Each structure stands twice: as C-alpha cells, then as structure tokens.
Amino acid sequence: TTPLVHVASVEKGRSYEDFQKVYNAIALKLREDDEYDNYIGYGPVLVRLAWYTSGTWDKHDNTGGSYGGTYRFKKEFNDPSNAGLQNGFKFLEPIHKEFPWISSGDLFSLGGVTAVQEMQGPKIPWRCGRVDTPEDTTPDNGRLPDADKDADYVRTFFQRLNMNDREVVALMGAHALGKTHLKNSGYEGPWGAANNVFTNEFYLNLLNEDWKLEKNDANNEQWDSKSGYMMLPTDYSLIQDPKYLSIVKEYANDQDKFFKDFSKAFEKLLENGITFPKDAPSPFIFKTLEEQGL
Ligand code: HEM
C-alpha cells in the first residue's frame, strides 16, 4: 500500500557504550571461531548478511531494507540466492541472546560493520534505532541480484537501492572478502588471496590477473585466473563497461579513496529506508578490539 515511514527509535536508555559492548562481543567471537570455512572465519559471511538484508530495499515503496530485521528466505536457505547466509545468523544468535535488547536490524547491520572493521577495513559510522516489524516480513524472493548478468543489469539493479556508478563499484569491492561456494550459489572460488583482510584487492585482481571464461561444475560460467581466483559475470562486467572500468582503476590505484568511498556507500546501504529524527544521536564510530587493547 502507501509507502510507510520508518523512524529510527533508540533502544530504551542505550548509548554508545552499550553498542560498543555488542561490537566487542561480535569481534571477540570472530576471533574465537577462527576455523569456520577453512579458517577464513565468519567475517565475510557477516558482511554478506548485512548486505543481503539491507539489499532487499526498494526505494519506490520503501519496503525491505535493514529497518524491520524481519525476512522470509526462499526455500529456507536452500536456494542458490541465499544459501549460506544461515551461517551468519547462527553466529549472531549467541550475541542476540546476551544482548536481547538490540533490535534484529541493528544486530545484522552492526555485524557487518564489526566484521569490516575487525578485518582491517575502514571505519564505518553506524546508527542505532532500527525496530523489529514482526507483522511485516520481507520475502527475499527475487529482490537480490543475479550473478549471471552484465553491466547494464548491474547498473539498473542498483538504481532500486539508489546507488550510482561509483557507489556500485565501491560496494562490490567487498568481494575481496570470502569466496563463492558451489553448493551455495553455483559458483566456486575466492576473489583473491587474503580472504579475511579488507583491502582493494578485488580491483587489483580484476585488472592484473589473466582471466579465462570457464564453466564450473554447476554448469555456470565464471571468470577464472591461474592464481586460483574467480570473478562472477557481474564482477567482471565492471571492467567490460567503460564507466565502471574507470572507477575500478581509480580504486585499484588509491586504497584510501576506496576505503573512504566504501565506508560512505556501506553506511548508506545499511541506512536506506530509515528516517532519523533531528535529535537522534550522531552516528557511532566504534573502536576495534585492537584499538582498545582487547
Ligand atoms: C551484483 C551484485 C552482487 C552479486 C551478484 C553478488 C553475488 C554473490 C554470490 C553469488 C556470492 C557467493 C555466495 C556463496 O556461494 O556462498 C556472494 C558472496 C559474498 N558477497 Fe556478493 N554479490 C553482490 C554484491 C555484494 C555486495 C554489494 C556486498 C557487500 C558490500 C557483497 C558481499 C559479499 C561477501 C562478503 C560475500 C562472501 C560471503 C562468504 O564468503 O561466505 N556482495 N555474493
């Protein structure tokens, strides 16, 4: 129906200190469960989870997004589009039990922020206030992007999330993290070498590696390199399109610029659909465990 408004409402009496504690719990668990996914750790899947939940947003009617924290996944994670995300939810369950006061949307988004920062990425300002909407669930059905498409598809798709060319290229840099798993999405292989360290490696690999279009064991095409890396058709489209290519080169040659742009685009992604009161607290910038000496 009519595009309802979602006003951020601070968890009763909570402030910076409370959220830094949740951040720390997530960060400590990331350090503890280091064996996950052949020692890649849960960092990447938490970032994917933050992106996926926020990526359901539609600027046209303000449905989906991170605010409600209530989703219905097609085939209950048994679909190529969402398979694997259950690992992120399982990881966050213990965190939510220790801090039952934090909303689901705040937890999912904070999980992504914490993961990026702990993996040495840029600081990502984060705002609290998302409110659970149990009577309003958002099916992920066809709301997230397909990986077997070209640049035109990518550009059009991201317009629904109100992201421009630079924002799209910056956000895609998160693929420096983790890997594709054949049993999950029908794609197999990591995008780079340091799977759990946030850097601009995604762009360097796109430009510097020798890519070959091959078919994986799920009969899907993907670009593979001799180094053992891979790129989805949508990732590779960033160097096939002349406008995207210019930006890829920019980030491949300026680590600081990429960090700054990613930080802005990621916060925007996590905040799409949310109306923050004029007197809402300012965004929080959490200290890493390293910065706290923990
Ligand atoms: C055209 C856009 C995108 C497409 C088609 C896409 C597709 C995929 C696919 C197929 C996987 C593999 C899932 C698996 O097999 O486990 C994946 C993983 C991942 N994606 Fe993307 N993605 C897109 C955008 C993004 C964005 C914007 C972010 C976040 C800023 C992101 C973060 C991640 C991360 C961190 C992983 C690794 C998860 C893990 O290792 O478990 N993706 N994505």
Broken C–N links (> 2.5 Å) in the chain, after residues: none
Residue 242 Ramachandran class (φ > 0 left, ψ -120 to 50 alpha, else beta): alpha
> Is residue 258 classed exposed, middle or buried when 0-12, 13-18 and 19+ CB atoms within 10 A define those classes?
buried
235 with 172: CB under 8 angstroms? yes
Strands 189-190 and 179-180: antiparallel
Domain spans of the chain? 4-144+266-294, 145-265
Cβ of 45 below 6 Å from ligand 1: yes
- The DSSP bridge partners found for residue 221 are 215
Q: How far is the CA of 175 from the centre of ligand 1 (A)?
A: 6
Q: How far is the CA of 253 from the centre of ligand 1 (A)?
A: 23
Q: Which long-range contacts (CB under 8 A, 24 or more apart) does 231-234 make?
A: 231/191, 231/205, 231/206, 232/147, 232/148, 232/175, 232/180, 232/187, 233/147, 233/148, 233/149, 233/150, 234/145, 234/146, 234/147, 234/148, 234/149, 234/150, 234/153, 234/154, 234/172
Q: How far is CA 209 from CA 217, 223, 226, 230, 285, in A?
A: 22, 10, 8, 10, 35
Cβ of 154 below 6 Å from ligand 1: yes
**DSSP secondary structure, 201-256, as one string:** HHHHHHHHS-EEEEE-TTS-EEEEETTS-EE-HHHHHHHHSHHHHHHHHHHHT-HH
Give the phi and the psi of residue 38 in degrees, each rounded to 5: 50, 50
Cβ of 47 below 6 Å from ligand 1: yes
| Residue type for position 288 | T
**DSSP secondary structure, 39-83, as one string:** HT-SHHHHHHHHHHHHTT-BTTTTBSSSSS--EE-GGGG-STTTT
Say what the alpha-carbon torsion angle 44, 48, 54, 58 is, to the nearest 10 degrees. 150
Tell the CATH topology of 4-144+266-294: Peroxidase; domain 1 (1.10.520)
Dihedral sign (CA 215, 142, 229, 207): positive
Cβ of 174 below 6 Å from ligand 1: yes
- The DSSP bridge partners found for residue 157 are none
Identify the CA nearest to 126 among candidates 66, 178, 85, 63: 66
Q: How far apart are CA 289 and CA 178, in angstroms?
A: 21
Cβ of 51 below 6 Å from ligand 1: yes
Under DSSP, the state recorded for 135 is T
CATH of 145-265, one of 2.40.260.10, 1.10.420.10, 2.60.120.260, 1.10.274.10: 1.10.420.10
Q: Which long-range contacts (CB under 8 A, 24 or more apart) does 246-249 make?
A: 247/165, 247/166, 247/169, 247/170, 248/169, 248/203, 248/206, 248/207, 249/203, 249/207
Q: How many CA atoms lie within 13 A of 98 on its CB side?
A: 15
List the resolution, Å.
1.6
Q: How many CA atoms lie within 13 A of 187 on its CB side?
A: 27
For residue 157 the two structure tokens come to: 């798709």
> Residue 275: which H helix or E strand, with range?
strand 274-275
Q: How far apart are CA 30 and CA 168, in angstroms?
A: 27
Method: X-ray
- The residue behind tokens 């070498």 is 193
